[PDB]
XYZ file of C-alpha atoms in Angstrom:
111
model
C 72.876 -27.683 58.121
C 70.068 -26.190 59.081
C 66.915 -24.725 56.724
C 66.249 -21.415 55.944
C 63.795 -19.211 54.103
C 64.534 -17.379 51.364
C 62.787 -15.638 48.236
C 62.419 -16.426 44.514
C 64.774 -13.270 44.118
C 67.659 -15.357 44.333
C 68.616 -16.773 40.615
C 69.634 -19.907 42.287
C 66.442 -20.350 43.850
C 64.837 -19.348 40.752
C 66.290 -22.190 38.489
C 65.666 -24.514 41.416
C 61.784 -23.709 41.190
C 62.126 -23.919 37.368
C 62.782 -27.326 37.859
C 60.037 -28.077 39.791
C 57.543 -26.549 37.674
C 58.895 -28.263 34.617
C 58.909 -31.390 36.135
C 55.286 -31.091 37.508
C 53.861 -29.952 34.458
C 55.825 -33.254 32.443
C 55.372 -35.626 35.139
C 52.922 -35.378 38.016
C 50.327 -33.442 36.648
C 48.641 -34.940 33.481
C 46.212 -32.012 32.326
C 46.591 -31.152 28.818
C 47.029 -27.417 29.870
C 50.098 -25.932 31.556
C 49.870 -24.716 35.271
C 52.098 -22.306 36.660
C 52.416 -21.038 40.711
C 50.014 -19.125 42.048
C 52.169 -18.891 45.174
C 55.483 -20.223 46.473
C 57.157 -20.246 49.642
C 60.807 -21.121 49.525
C 64.004 -22.972 51.820
C 67.191 -23.831 51.360
C 69.801 -26.208 52.932
C 73.628 -25.908 52.792
C 74.625 -29.857 53.045
C 77.704 -31.668 52.112
C 77.977 -31.916 48.294
C 75.427 -29.365 47.247
C 72.323 -27.898 48.410
C 68.483 -28.576 49.004
C 65.511 -26.630 48.054
C 62.343 -26.833 49.853
C 59.147 -25.411 47.983
C 55.021 -25.245 48.892
C 53.519 -24.329 45.424
C 50.262 -23.599 44.609
C 49.395 -23.908 40.756
C 46.506 -23.142 38.899
C 45.748 -23.932 35.538
C 46.509 -21.814 32.864
C 44.831 -21.209 29.143
C 47.917 -22.606 27.665
C 48.417 -25.876 26.187
C 51.508 -27.734 27.436
C 52.731 -27.827 23.883
C 52.427 -24.429 22.991
C 56.052 -22.447 22.886
C 55.058 -19.375 24.989
C 54.651 -20.166 28.548
C 54.732 -18.609 31.881
C 52.910 -15.823 30.907
C 49.716 -17.454 30.353
C 46.798 -16.277 31.903
C 45.120 -18.634 34.489
C 41.482 -19.842 33.691
C 39.353 -17.452 35.286
C 36.251 -19.923 35.098
C 34.290 -21.652 37.681
C 35.333 -25.582 38.085
C 38.337 -24.989 35.840
C 40.842 -23.671 38.106
C 42.256 -26.882 38.763
C 44.607 -25.539 41.834
C 46.868 -27.960 43.433
C 49.699 -27.516 46.644
C 52.668 -29.374 46.396
C 55.478 -29.583 48.693
C 58.966 -29.992 46.855
C 62.253 -31.054 48.243
C 65.004 -30.440 45.181
C 68.303 -31.606 45.355
C 71.215 -29.390 43.425
C 74.824 -29.782 43.203
C 75.897 -25.875 42.820
C 78.666 -26.876 40.900
C 78.329 -29.518 38.546
C 75.108 -28.695 36.884
C 72.961 -31.497 38.557
C 69.623 -31.257 39.685
C 66.986 -33.495 41.441
C 63.411 -33.695 43.099
C 64.230 -35.932 45.978
C 60.595 -35.674 46.971
C 57.427 -34.188 46.219
C 53.578 -34.249 47.760
C 50.760 -33.016 46.128
C 46.948 -32.499 46.917
C 44.144 -30.597 45.098
C 42.897 -27.695 46.442
């Protein structure tokens, strides 16, 4: 039941992160432009009935609108006062055998 540090080079860890980014852009952040991670610290914890992932993520605003097909490889806005970076911590729970995943808690603060 302990929480261990891990990297993004793990298929499962990546999927959990993608879910956090999607939720950040869809529900938490209200900007017109898409934000993606500048930094990420990850940890995981195995519990009865699933696994929890913990992420400390620093988001940066990109030059892509949230409504355009291609994203992820979107350049970050590099203009003064238009960066709009934010640090968020996410607690994500998944059931590694039922395709179930959800956000348990999160806290964001602009950098």
